Amino acid sequence: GSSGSSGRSYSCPVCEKSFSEDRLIKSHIKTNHPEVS
Numbered sequence: 001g002s003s004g005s006s007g008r009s010y011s012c013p014v015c016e017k018s019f020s021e022d023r024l025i026k027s028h029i030k031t032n033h034p035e036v037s
Ligand SMILES: [Zn+2]
Pocket: 012, 013, 014, 015, 016, 017, 028, 029, 032, 033
């Protein structure tokens, strides 16, 4: 509902998980989610 906060963040639409780095989310999904994309 309340809208007033948005930026450039990389979220994991696979396991609704978040990461600090931008290269972590990429590798994570790759390994963690091998055939779940
Ligand atoms: Zn994930």
